[PDB]
Structure formats: structure tokens, C-alpha cells
Amino acid sequence: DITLAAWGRRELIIAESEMPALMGLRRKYAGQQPLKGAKILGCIHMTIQTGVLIETLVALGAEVRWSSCNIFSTQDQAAAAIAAAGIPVFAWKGETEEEYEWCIEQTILKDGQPWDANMVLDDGGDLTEILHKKYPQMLERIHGITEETTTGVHRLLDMLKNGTLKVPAINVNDSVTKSKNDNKYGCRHSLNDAIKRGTDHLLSGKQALVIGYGDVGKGSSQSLRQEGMIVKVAEVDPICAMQACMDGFEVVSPYKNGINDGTEASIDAALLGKIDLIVTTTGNVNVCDANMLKALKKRAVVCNIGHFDNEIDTAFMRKNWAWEEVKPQVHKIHRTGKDGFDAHNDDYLILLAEGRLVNLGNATGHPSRIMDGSFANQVLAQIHLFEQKYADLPAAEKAKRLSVEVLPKKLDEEVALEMVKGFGGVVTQLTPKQAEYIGVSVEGPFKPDTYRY
Amino acid sequence: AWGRRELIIAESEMPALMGLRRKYAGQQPLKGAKILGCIHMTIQTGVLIETLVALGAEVRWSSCNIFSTQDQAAAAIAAAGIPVFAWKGETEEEYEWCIEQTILKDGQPWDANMVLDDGGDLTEILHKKYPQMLERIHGITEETTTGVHRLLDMLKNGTLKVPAINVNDSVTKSKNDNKYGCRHSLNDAIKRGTDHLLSGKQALVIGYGDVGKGSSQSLRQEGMIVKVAEVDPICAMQACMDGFEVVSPYKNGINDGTEASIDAALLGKIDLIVTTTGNVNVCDANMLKALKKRAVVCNIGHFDNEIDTAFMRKNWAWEEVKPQVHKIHRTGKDGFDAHNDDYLILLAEGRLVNLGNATGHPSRIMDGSFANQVLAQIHLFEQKYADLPAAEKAKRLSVEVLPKKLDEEVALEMVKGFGGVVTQLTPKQAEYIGVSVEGPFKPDTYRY
Amino acid sequence: VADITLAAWGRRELIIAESEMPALMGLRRKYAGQQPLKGAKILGCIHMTIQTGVLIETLVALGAEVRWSSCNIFSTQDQAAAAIAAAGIPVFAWKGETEEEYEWCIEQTILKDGQPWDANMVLDDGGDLTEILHKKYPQMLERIHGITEETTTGVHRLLDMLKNGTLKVPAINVNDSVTKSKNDNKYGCRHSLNDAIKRGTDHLLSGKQALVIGYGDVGKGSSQSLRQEGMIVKVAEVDPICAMQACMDGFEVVSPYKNGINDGTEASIDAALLGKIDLIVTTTGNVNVCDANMLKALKKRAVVCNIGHFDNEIDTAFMRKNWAWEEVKPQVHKIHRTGKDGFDAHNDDYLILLAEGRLVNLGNATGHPSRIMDGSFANQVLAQIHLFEQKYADLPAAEKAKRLSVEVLPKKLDEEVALEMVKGFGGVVTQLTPKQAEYIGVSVEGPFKPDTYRY
Amino acid sequence: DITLAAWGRRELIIAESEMPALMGLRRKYAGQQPLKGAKILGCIHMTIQTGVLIETLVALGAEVRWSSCNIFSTQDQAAAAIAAAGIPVFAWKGETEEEYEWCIEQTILKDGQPWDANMVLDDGGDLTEILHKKYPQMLERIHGITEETTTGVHRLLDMLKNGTLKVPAINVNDSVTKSKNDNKYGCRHSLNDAIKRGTDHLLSGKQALVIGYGDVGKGSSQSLRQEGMIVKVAEVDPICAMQACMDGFEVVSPYKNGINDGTEASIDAALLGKIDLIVTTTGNVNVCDANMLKALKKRAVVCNIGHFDNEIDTAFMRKNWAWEEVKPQVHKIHRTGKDGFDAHNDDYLILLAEGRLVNLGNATGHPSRIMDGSFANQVLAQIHLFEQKYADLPAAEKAKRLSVEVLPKKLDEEVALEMVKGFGGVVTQLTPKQAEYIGVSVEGPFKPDTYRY
Ligand SMILES: NC(=O)c1ccc[n+]([C@@H]2O[C@H](COP(=O)([O-])OP(=O)(O)OC[C@H]3O[C@@H](n4cnc5c(N)ncnc54)[C@H](O)[C@@H]3O)[C@@H](O)[C@H]2O)c1
Ligand SMILES: NC(=O)c1ccc[n+]([C@@H]2O[C@H](COP(=O)([O-])OP(=O)(O)OC[C@H]3O[C@@H](n4cnc5c(N)ncnc54)[C@H](O)[C@@H]3O)[C@@H](O)[C@H]2O)c1
Ligand SMILES: NC(=O)c1ccc[n+]([C@@H]2O[C@H](COP(=O)([O-])OP(=O)(O)OC[C@H]3O[C@@H](n4cnc5c(N)ncnc54)[C@H](O)[C@@H]3O)[C@@H](O)[C@H]2O)c1
């Protein structure tokens, strides 16, 4: 379908007014054109907030090839707007696992020849793995790697220890305006909006359980508390559990004594018989096991917010229990049956997004004003690695240039200022008598690298 | 009489210390530790300094930070026969007499191994005046910020070959005091000092650090329309996200000193100004004389130079209602008839809240403060310094911050105190993230 | 009517919905066998939706027969009526939308072939049935026991009609009830406003500045929705008492006019306050509460929404000839404030409106969630049983002049609905002890509070 | 040490700007002198803000005598300010009840002869019953009685039902400035202050129980939630218990299945072993029983914001459990020991506000700016009753003139407008065209008499 081209154009115009920090590059850095001949490829979710990134990159003179990393992430009006520039590009939502690979494989080929790529944009680390294992000759003129999310970073870390890593990498996720802006406040806007779009229930007075208290979990739990639920949290890391205790929640283990023995007798079935909704944030293997999932209340909602679907055991339910569909990203799953179910039965569960990313699945995603801070960091990081020309310096210099890297604080503050001025806010200036007092210039970093904010 | 009663309570609202004690009892991993302690006596350290010496340990204590010394803890200790006074002497001449009768009891010096210095002032004399004793030490524990700068630069300058460990950078130390300590204490104190209605009016808070983050919620949760001022763009970014309004006392924020630079329109509509930063002259005198009538002035930022009190004293007169609350009148240096319109009010002295209205935070907040240092001590005594050869030490030299493992063991007992429970991992699951069932779950770059 | 085979989808659509109405189901289960409504004959005219079908299916389960239609023109969901019609109850709600059918539907509802029907109860949804019953078929008024109405506009008509003597059989209104008013007004918009905003514009709602005109019972719910998301909001009002509550709840009270008076000249507008507001919400029923001069002073790229009923609460007539209109999505619009004759797409000074003075909650939403609509329909089921026990119609002509009166819903029947809604959340209420009740002076069965208690 | 009266006056003299309506009362009726030396007797727990009313009454030309209502609310330093103004007072904190009742009868009799009285102020009906069972020849002289609180309205209605009530009264709880303003926000502002001032504990992450969800219940719950607590709500009325679910609170019952029958096995020992703070807000005879506190967890803290001490079975705690006083307002209650104890026990109890009322027993109490409207209507009701002089009416007409009435609309609207202007708000004036259309006068009653506000 091609109708959505005009609709996305109006949304982008309103989106541009909502991203003052990223739009500043189109006026300041459009003069010297820092990026010339930087052939790169990208992979993160495609929303209207992603469209302006490709727009500015094309405007500055760079060219990209792009793809989505999750099945239920694509916004059909955002993808059509980028295709309106005449590029033949294919991307959509709701495809099988085999079709998901077929799009990535089309990205890195041009009718027979691999792309002459120099840098990458990869979240999760999927496309990272294919290029190392399947096409060893792709990484021959690569300068760096730009990674957005946490799951990718762990993919990068172990590959340094084994020596398979061959090029330096930058971790944009560590910037303060990414993890303290996108992970925390991004999910708070989107979670409860996505939930109410699917079930269309009244959230006031119900009970919910959230697993994990990381940066995503904080915003998710706030997004549910601000609607009127009663929320409880579980955690393995005592620091996060302490934060949960001091933020006004209750902490509990879904297994007896907090020890997952493996048998059904170790499940605290009493407490799980009073829970109406489950959200999983951990991004780990099997944090919602099949033995747990058979002890929940009738007509209970299950959803996942982590990047991968290893959090809930959807494999067991497909082999034992029956499935029926209500609407996209909504399912009904009866118990004690495989061949069929009674039409008037009341013993069933309901699943959202099939255990995948729910807020991009059942909703639009994070607002345009939040991704502004997460994208200027990426664009600045792209420059900071291009001029170094890692493909050209001699191997005698390569052995010392391969080290951990991250953007400095001044480049982050130059984005934070333009974001703050977008709201109509004002930032004061220090007199010289005060600037010399604290050891910080009138213009420069006000905090060290150890500061946690 | 009453000084013996609070000890039972003090044992009762410290879950972590008693949990560690009952975990390590029987085994007694450490016996006859030679900690020479000098941190200020407080109501929480009473048991582990008087019970042990009553059973027969017979180890003396002292107070380095005399300004923070409280007579209540000393009176609680005084119920025993230990010759300790901790009196408010405040004179050096009589103080030297007390010192000499403590180091030696039976005529011989005691084999002190570690000094508990959190001031870093006497640590550069005596023990370094003759290096004979310096060959038998274990470590050092300092808490004050910018006070360890002396240790750090006389380490880099090359006059020390001893690594130092910092207790302040611990994760549990940051959130308990910087963020969660202020949110509980500010809202109670601001109302306790004046008994006003924090609803419908407008307030102005300066800075959006950890203290500012804690203060803004303590004011906004009651219905006060709060505004924030900040020089750091990142803190202002967090200010805009939490739902606050960011403004500037100066026209476009440029402080020229002339009267035509102050935006006097806003200052006449604002009902409160409070300072949370640590910078100098943040409350300027030019905007001080252009506030709305009958505003309240507050300060918590540990610095007395934030508000221009000198200009205020030389131009405006005070009224001493009591030594705990001060009123100030803007009519002139004297001559108020009975009650006028032009006046302001000050909390305690303008300097600190800790002048006597309230001390610190409730014991549950300060549970972790003393918990980290005792684990730092237990870690050092597990291994003997003289048994490690000096060869391979010089072959592998590095400086490392406190391991995350010791801090997690603090929070486990403290979460268990509230009634929660923490799930144990499975061997198959723990290999996906690359950390064992008990190992540190986060890298050192991760910001909690 | 379309396909009868598609009623199967409506069947399971009702079945899934049934899980979220505990009160209706509790009253259905408890009254089985006792049969309160045996022999009753009911007429209904409420707009046909999913929950409406629940109302019809729960009325017929207790032993009553019903005939149904729709008072409204545009409000009809064809899926739900098919299920009930297949179940075996005569239904006549469809989307004709033609003037010829409007005259045909009214007489056909009661008269089928020339022989009048033996009606005994009426449910009206605005007062249309009440008018035609007393004015055009007075011959059958002797057999009707009473009428129940849930809308205030029909209540005023009913009361004005009472004085003229045209009313002949009693009626009961339910709008003033607690479980009707608070659920329909406050919780209804608190859940829906911020959901409707975020589906329309997708804007980062936290950090921006909003204005709310009015603090009525709807206004409080609309104002609480925004403050929990992360905005800053302002309140404007004309009533001193209800304005005093906003100051205590943590707001700031302002006016769009200088000194509060409106002389009608350009100098009376406060531009120091309208220049920073990007969201304005009107929660009144009055006319022209937002004048054309406020629309010339608003900040660029602002959002306006109306939650009343009329296109006359805000000055759309001033924008109907001076400004240009452009459509963004199904129900959001752009209004460019640079002129009339043409406009480029890269304009800055435009404005954004939601549904222009019309319903915002039927255009792209399903309105109130199904749990609140439980409380509106479960109040009307108890009234019909109450009127049935009184037995007005069969009384002698002498005693018919003493029973006739207008009365509000009794407090005890009000408390019955609330009991079976708390148990839907798993809530367990406490039962009074005989020793305790006599100390307070209320019955163990209830009620517990006076009739003028301000809830 | 009476000399604290100077400090009391100095504290009192700076609270004038918080009460605009009470000031405007003088700025409107100083030129008429309505009381003209009328004799006003009353009873209420006195404070600085009641001292403002007392000094206003004295400045209006009258002379009053005043007694205390609660043991803990003497406020010797605050009462000394009025005591130095020639008005004798008889109160002493911590006094035995026999001395208090001997003091109460002291002011009734002056030189062996009953003092003159024209109006009476009352709190809780304690003085009214004394007047009705002692010197019954006193009621005929009194012209009117002004009283407050929900309980007092019930007492007056019961008296009217018995038919023995004379000298009609005026109900002030009906007015908005007293019901939905004083009752809700006074607790929300004072409860946390009092408990944190008395106990100094941390009020984040713990569990508490609040019984009843009326106006005072609707107010006291928010202060606990905003401090980070997780609290539970129970009540007997379905209507008010429904509101708790919609506000986001959780509903339980101390008894199994909701049926109480008086046996030890009928209570639910599960939830009671978790709650640590109990605030009871019903003002009844018995909301908790003897066996409720046997299942209570160790070291809980008790509270009472009702009207009487009946709501705790203090008689049960007196016969079997010994009391030993160690610290004012905070002392220990043992659970199993009698006439002796072991050296150490972990099973004692912590008490606050023994039997009597919190806040104004352990703190300053209700603040000044909130109680502007209450005292404003308190004075204006006396003015209104004075505008309907008695002892001039026809004898045959007196029988049919007696009726029950409530304060009209415009007076309360003017009081509210006075309070609005004190915060800086501006109220819009309705246009003449909008008066014709809606059908309300420009300044008259805007709400129908049945509005629930
Ligand atoms: N959808 C989005 O917009 C988005 C954004 C960022 C990150 N993510 C995803 O979120 C996930 C985690 O993000 P993060 O930055 O919050 O991670 P994080 O590392 O900061 O925190 C994860 C938490 O899980 C806890 N945990 C681990 N195993 C547990 C168990 N069995 N039970 C309870 N707690 C357990 C850890 O202690 C930790 O506190 C990743 O999969 C990442 O890709 C999604
Ligand atoms: N309350 C306590 O118990 C306690 C204990 C120790 C220290 N402190 C004090 O707390 C102070 C601040 O605490 P923190 O570490 O959370 O703050 P911080 O160190 O994180 O930063 C304070 C903020 O003030 C801002 N600031 C500086 N100059 C400013 C100016 N002219 N105008 C506006 N804003 C300005 C800075 O940008 C910064 O954001 C420290 O200076 C320290 O002395 C308090
Ligand atoms: N859309 C919905 O979901 C919904 C729900 C219930 C009711 N309603 C209807 O919409 C309206 C909602 O109002 P309500 O039920 O809360 O009644 P209400 O009478 O309590 O509200 C009237 C409010 O408007 C204020 N007001 C009146 N004229 C004003 C003016 N010129 N400027 C400023 N403030 C002014 C009054 O002070 C008062 O606060 C009613 O007409 C009601 O029938 C709509």
C-alpha cells in the first residue's frame, strides 16, 4: 500500500517542531558537511521519530540502508514517508520469522554485490552477529560500531575477550541523555497507553506484577502507578530492590523462599491467585516459566517489554494449550486442552504482543520529544568516529587504538541545552567569581565522569 | 536511668547490623581486632562500644569531630565505669591534660594498627613524623568529601606507597542521603519552622542536583507550584521531565549587577526562595531587595555564603524573637511602630538546619552509613599484611574502588528487614548474563 | 438487516464483555427462581450498544418480556442488536438516517397491525415516548404502572408537565443518585481524556502548559487526568466556592480578561497569560466561554478540545469565514493563523483542534470503559422491580389520586448496586454488628447516611 | 512560668495576613457593633487560631469565659496570651479527670449565682448534657447555640427526635467551607506532621490500615500515600467503599468472609501480622475488639483521629497488661507480662495519643489559613441569628416560627470569594448576555440547593 505517504509528511512537519536539539544540526553543521562519503547501514525500530534521522542524514549528504529489528515495531505511515523520496525500500509489521530474515538479507546486497559499508547502526546486536559469522569479508573497511540498547552492548563485550572483535565500538547507551531520558521516561508514556488500547479495561483498583527494577522497570512501574493500580515488584539485585522499597512498592518472590527448585510445590500459589496483569522487564532467559504460568488467576493479562521473548515460556503453551485470536496482538489461551475449547468456557488467559515488545507493538511508541535527546547523541557519535579513518591507519597503530570509547560530556551538554531551550526554559550564566570558585570555566563540563546523576 | 533504655530500641531499628552479627556469631571470623576508633559518638554506635568493653574487651574510644559531638551518647556511655568524658571543653590547654591519661594505661603504649580518621587533619603528624610504625599498617577509612584531596595529592606527589580506599563513592551511600534523605526532611522542617499552607502559592528552588531533586518533590507533593533555576543543562533537562517550570532571576540569565538586569516582575509574584546548591552568592543582593512582601528565606546547601547576609545586615534590621527563629524588617535599621508590611523571616540562622531543630535523618536512612565501614574493616583484617610478599605486589600494582560485592550484602539484610524476599538465580539462567549466582550483577560504568 | 449469520461474532463479543460487569451478573444470579419480574411488560428506548444488549439479556432472564428501540438517530451498533434478535427478543434499532423512516418508526413501535399492545412499563431516553404517550395515545394510560428516565433534560420536561396536569402515571428519576452521578461524570472523563489526547496528537504530554475553564464535577475529573501525566495546568472560573477547592488542590486561578471584566474591546485581553498556554480545555455548558479575541492571542501550535455538547461553547463561527481549515487525520484539524487566501505547508502560526465542537469520544474511541457503564444500567434494573411492587395501575380510581407522586431513587436500592460492584474488585465489605448499629441509630440492613449527605 | 504569654502574643500577631475573610469581617461590621456586649460562652480545644477568634470577640466589645475540651490540647503558652487579657482560665495538661471535671463546674457557678448567658459555643455536646441535667432553669434565657462537627449534628438531631430540644441551633457542617474544606485538608496537612514529629520514623515502604472512607477518611489516606506508604482501607458502607477502589486503594476486612460473630476464630490472622501503623477514623463505640490486637505484629504504633476513646478497648489493655510511663506521650504496653517481666522482650507495644486525640495532642494541629472559612461562618451565623431578635414576637406566632434552617448561599459565596483573593486568583464576571441565557443573576446563587459540590 502507498496511500500513507502524504499522512506521514504532515506528521513529520509537526515532528520537526518537536525536536529542537536534532534540528539544530541542520543549521549549524550543514555548512562544513562533516560526513562525506561515509557509506553506512542502520538497524533500529522504524517510527516517525526514526524518519527524521534518515531525513537529516540524507540532507547532510550521507546515504543509508535501513531495517527494523522487531516484528511488531514498524509504523506503516512512517516507513511510507521515507519511501516517498523514490527509494525502493520494503518494511512492514506482522510477518513470520522467515520473512524477518529475508528483509535483512536484502539490506546488505545490491543485485549481487555487498554494500561498501564503513559504519553501522545496530540495536540488540542481531545484525552484528550475521556479519561476523556469515560474511567475514564485510568487516574490512569498518571504522566503528554504534549501539543503542543494552542487549547489544553485552554482545559487544564478550566478543572483545575472545578476539573475534576486530574494530573499535562506541556505546551511545551510556550517555546521560539516552539512558536517563529514553529508558526511564520513554516507557512511562507508552506502556499504559498500549495496555488500554488492547484490553480497553479500567485500570483503577486492579493488581499488577512487574518483574525487574532496571531503568525500563522504573518507568513501567510509574506508568502503572499513575493510573491507579496496585503494583508489586520482584528482583535479584538487592540495590534495585532497595530502590523499589523506597519508592512505595512491595517486593516479593514468585517462588517459595526465593529458590526456584523446579517442582510445582515450590511456587507460592497463594499470592499469584490475586494478580490480574504481568509485565516482564528483565530481558533474561525464562523469568516466567510454564509451571508459574499455570497457577495465575483466570482471565489474566500477560505482556512483555524486554527486547527478546525468552522472558516468558511461550513454547510450552503452543504444545499443550489451545489458542484463539481476538484481534492483532491479542490472543485467548484456554487451559486443560489442546484439541479444542468450549465456546462458553471461562478458563483462559489473554496474551499481548505474543510476548514481544508491547509498547511498540500495541501502540506508537515513545513521543517525538523524548527521542530527540537519544538521536543527537547517536549523530554526534557518528561524526566522532568517521574522521579517525580506522580503515586507513597502519596496523602498527591499530594495536593501540583498539580500546573502549564513549563520547565526552561537552557534546552531551550541547544537546541538553538545546533540549531545555525547546520547552521555553532559560539557563543562567555563572559570574567569573563563581566559576573560578568551583574550578569550572564559564563554558565547559560542570561534573566529572564519576558523577552518577 | 533513661540513658540505658534507648539501647534496646537502637538495637531494634537497625536490621542490617544485628543481622550481620547473628550471621557471623559462633564462628567469630574476626577476633581481637585492633581498630583504634575516633569517629564522633552517636546514639547508634553505643552498643558496639560499651557492651564489648563491659564483657571484658576493655577498648577505649574517642571523638575526632568535636563539632558534631552530642552529650547524649556520652551520657549513655557514662553509666559504665569506663573513664571517658567527652565533655564540651572547647579549650586546648585543658584538653592536653585529658589526652595523656588515655594512650597509656599500665605504662606501655598500645599496638594500634588502624586509625579511624574522618577529618584528615592530625593524620599527617605523629605517625609520619617517625616512619618506624608505618611498616605495620593495614589501611585507612575517610568519609568527608574534598578532605581526602590531601591524601590523594600527597599520594600522587610520591610520598606514599600505601593504597587508599574511599567509602564515600558507595552506591548505597549516595541514594540514602543525597536523594532520599532530603525528601523526607525538607517538607517536615519547612512547615515545622513556620506552619504555613503549602498549597496554591508559588515557590522557587535553586539547582537540580540530588538535593534539588529530593527537595522539589517534597514541595510539589503538597500542591506548591514549584519553579527551578539551574546552571547545568543536564539537571535542567531532568527538571523539565519531572513536570517543573524552569526560570531565571536575571534577564536572559546574564548577571550584570545593574538594576536594569533583574527581572523584577517575576520576583514580585514568587512567594518562596530556597537554595540547594553549594555555590557562592547564588542569592544576590540586588534581587534580594526586590522580592514579594513577607517571603520566607531558607538555606540547606551547607554554605553560608549563598545568601548575601552581609548586605542584608548592613542595610536591614533584625528582630530576635528567639535564638531558633529570626525575623527581619525591611522598613529600616530601626523604628517599626508595632507591625509593618515590609519584612521577611529566616529559619534558624540562615546557615544550617542542623543548628538544633533536627539532626540528620531517621535511623533507617543512616543504617547503611555505618554498615559499609564495618564491612570495609572486616575485609581488611581477613588477610594479614605482613604475610604477603612484597615482590609480586610490585609486579602487579593497581588502585581499585570498593568492590560492588560488599555493597550488595548490605542491601540484602535491609530489604529483608521490610519483609521482602530476593529470588536466587538458577545455574542455567545465570550464564546468559555472564555473572555467577552470587557475583556482582552490574559493571562499574552502570549508573544506578 | 444485513446478515443474520454474523450474530455469532456479536455473541462472543458479548461473552467477553460479560466478564467485566460483576454487578449485573450478581443481580442476575441472586434473583433466579424468585422471579421478581414475572408478568411484567417493559418498553425500552435506550441507545443500542454492547452493554445495552447486556441490559436486555439480564432483564429477560428474571421473567419479563421486553420490546426495544432507539431514541437516538446516529447511535446504533448493528452487531449487538443481531445477537439479541437471534436470542428471540423483538428489536427495531437500525441506521436508516432518512427523514422518511423517522416518521415511520415511531408508530410502528407500538402498533403492529391495528390492534394496540398491552404495555405496562416504559424506558425513555430523552422524553420522546413520554410526549407521544400522553399526547397522542391517551387511551392506554390506565394500564401503565410508570416510567423511568435517566436524563435530566427529560426530568425538567417531566416536572414542567406535572404542573399542567398532562402527566397521569408516576415516574422515578435516577440522575441525582451517587452511583450514577459520580461514575458517569468524574471517573468517566478521568479515564478517557488523557487517552483521547494521546491517540490524537501523540505529543509528549509532560512539561507543557495547559488551561482548564471550569471546575465542576466533570471539571475536577478532567483536571486530575492532566496533572498525573506531568503537565502544569491552570483553572478559570466564576463561582467562588468551587474555585476555592482548586487553590487547595494545588492549582492557580486566573482569568483571560484584565481585572476580570470584559468590556468587549481589544485592550481587555490578557496577553501575558495566553501567550504561554498550548492546551485549553472547556468543561462548561455555557455559551461563548472562549471569545474570538482569545483565539487571536494564543501561542502558536496550541491544542483545543471541547467536552460539552454544542458547537457554540467556543467561537467556531469566527473561524468559519476568516481562517482556513485543513485535516490531518480522521478527527484532528489544522487552522492556519496567517490569513485566508492560500497557505503554504511550512507555516508556524497554525492551530490544532480536536473534534470541532462535536463528540470526541465516539469518533475514534469506544467512549467510557465497560466497567463504568455497569453502574449506569444496574441502577435502572432495580427501579423497575420497585415500581412493579407498588401496583399503581390495578388500584381503584379513588386511590389513584393519592399514590401519584414524583420520588427519587431510594437510598437502600442505591446501596444495593454498590455492594455488588466492590465484590467485582475482590473487595470484602464488613457487616454491621447489632450492638454497633443501635449506637449509631441506623438499621443493620441500612441505609447509613442522611438523604442530604454531600458525597 | 506564665511569661511565655509575650512569646504567644508575638507569634499570634503575625498570622493576620493568612485570614483575609476574618479581617474583612472587621472591615465590614466594625461600624455597627452588633454584639453590643452580648455574653458568649463556649467550649472548644483552644489554639492560637482560636485565640484569634477570642481576641476578635473581645475587641468587638464583649467578655467571655472559656474552658478546655481535651486534656492534651491545653497549649499553656498559647492560652497564656488570652489569660493575660483578664479572662480567667482553668486547665492543666496531664491532670487527673476528677480535677478536670471539678474545673469544668467551676466556671458554671460564679459567687453562688448562675452567670448571664445569651449564646453558647459547644464542641462534642459534653457541656450541653451538663446544662440539660444541671440547672435546667438555664435554657430559657439562652437565645441560640452554635456547634460544629458531624457527631454534634447527630446529637442535635437525636435531641430533636426526642422532642425535648429547646433554643434552636444552626448547623455549620452543611456549609461548604466547613465540610469539604476543613474536614478533608486539615487531616491531610496535620496527620503526617504530628506522627513524624512524635515518632521520627521513616514513613516510606511500610504498611498501614485506615478504617472508614468518609471525608476525614478521604483526607487522611492521601497524606499517607504521598509519603510513600502502602495502605489498606476498610469500611462498612458500600457507597463509600466503592470510592476507595476507584481512587486506587485496596479493600480488605479484619474478619473472615466479612461476617463477625464474636469468636476468636472469626478474625483473619493473615493481614494483621503485616500492618505496623493503625489510624482509626470512625468515631464509634467498637470498631476493633480485644482479639484484633492479639494477632497484631510486634511494635505497631496506634493512632486515633475519631471523637471518643471507645474505638480502642483500652479497658481490655488495662486489666491484663501493665502500664509504665517512661516518656511523655510515648510509652510502652506489654502484651503477655503482668506484675513482672523478663529482662528483655521483643513483644511490647508502642502507643501514641492514649485514648485522646492526635495532632492537637502531639503537635500544633490544624493550620491557620485553612480555618479561615470555618471561623468566618462561625461569626456570621451569630450575626445572622442576632438579625432575628427574639422576645419581641407574638405569643401565638412563636409556636409556628420555630423551624430548622441552614445558612443561605450568598454569604458563603462572599466568604469563598474572600479566600480566593487571598491566594492571588481572579474570578471572572459573568456577562449580561450569559445571565439571560443560563438563567442566573450576576452575583446571586449559582448552584441549586441540591448540588453536591
Ligand atoms: N523497549 C524499549 O524501549 C527498551 C529500551 C531500553 C532497553 N530495553 C530492553 O530492556 C531490557 C533491560 O533494559 P535495562 O536497561 O532496564 O536493563 P538493566 O540491566 O539496567 O536491568 C535489568 C534488571 O533485571 C534484574 N534481574 C535480572 N534477572 C532477574 C530475575 N530473574 N528476577 C528479577 N530481576 C532480575 C537485574 O538485577 C537488573 O536490575 C533489555 O532487554 C533492553 O533491550 C527496551
Ligand atoms: N544536606 C546534607 O546533608 C549535605 C551533606 C553534604 C554536602 N551537602 C551539600 O550539598 C550541596 C549540593 O548537593 P548535591 O551534591 O546534590 O548538588 P550537586 O553537587 O549535585 O550540584 C548542585 C547544583 O547547583 C547548581 N548550581 C551551581 N551554581 C549555580 C548557580 N549560580 N545558579 C544555579 N544553580 C547553580 C549546579 O549546576 C548543580 O546542578 C553540596 O555543595 C554540599 O556542600 C549537603
Ligand atoms: N462529556 C461527558 O462525558 C459529560 C459527562 C457528564 C456530563 N456532561 C455534561 O457536560 C456538562 C458537564 O458539567 P457538569 O456535569 O460537571 O456540571 P456543573 O454544573 O457542575 O459545571 C458547571 C461549571 O462551569 C462553571 N462555569 C459556568 N459558566 C462559566 C464561565 N462562563 N466561565 C467559567 N466557568 C464557568 C461553573 O462555575 C461550574 O464550575 C454538563 O452540561 C453535563 O450535562 C458531559
Ligand SMILES: NC(=O)c1ccc[n+]([C@@H]2O[C@H](COP(=O)([O-])OP(=O)(O)OC[C@H]3O[C@@H](n4cnc5c(N)ncnc54)[C@H](O)[C@@H]3O)[C@@H](O)[C@H]2O)c1
Ligand atoms: N482532629 C480530629 O480528631 C478530628 C477532626 C475532624 C473530624 N474528626 C472526626 O471525624 C469524624 C467525621 O468524619 P466524616 O465527616 O467523614 O463523617 P462520616 O460519618 O462520613 O465518616 C465516618 C465513616 O465511618 C464509617 N464507619 C462507621 N462505622 C464503621 C465501622 N465500625 N468500621 C468501619 N467503618 C465504619 C462510615 O461508613 C463513614 O464512612 C467524626 O467522628 C469526628 O470526630 C476528628
Ligand SMILES: Nc1ncnc2c1ncn2[C@@H]1O[C@H](CO)[C@@H](O)[C@H]1O
Ligand atoms: N519510537 C521509537 N523509535 C525508534 N526506536 C525506538 C522507539 N522507542 C523505543 N526505541 C528503541 O527501542 C530499543 C529497544 O526497544 C531501545 O534502544 C529504544 O531506544
Ligand SMILES: Nc1ncnc2c1ncn2[C@@H]1O[C@H](CO)[C@@H](O)[C@H]1O
Ligand atoms: N487546631 C485546631 N484548632 C481549631 N479547630 C481544630 C483544630 N484541629 C482540629 N479542629 C477542629 O476540631 C474538630 C474536631 O477535632 C473539627 O471540627 C476540626 O476541624
Ligand SMILES: [K+]
Ligand atoms: K511515538
Ligand SMILES: [K+]
Ligand atoms: K495552631
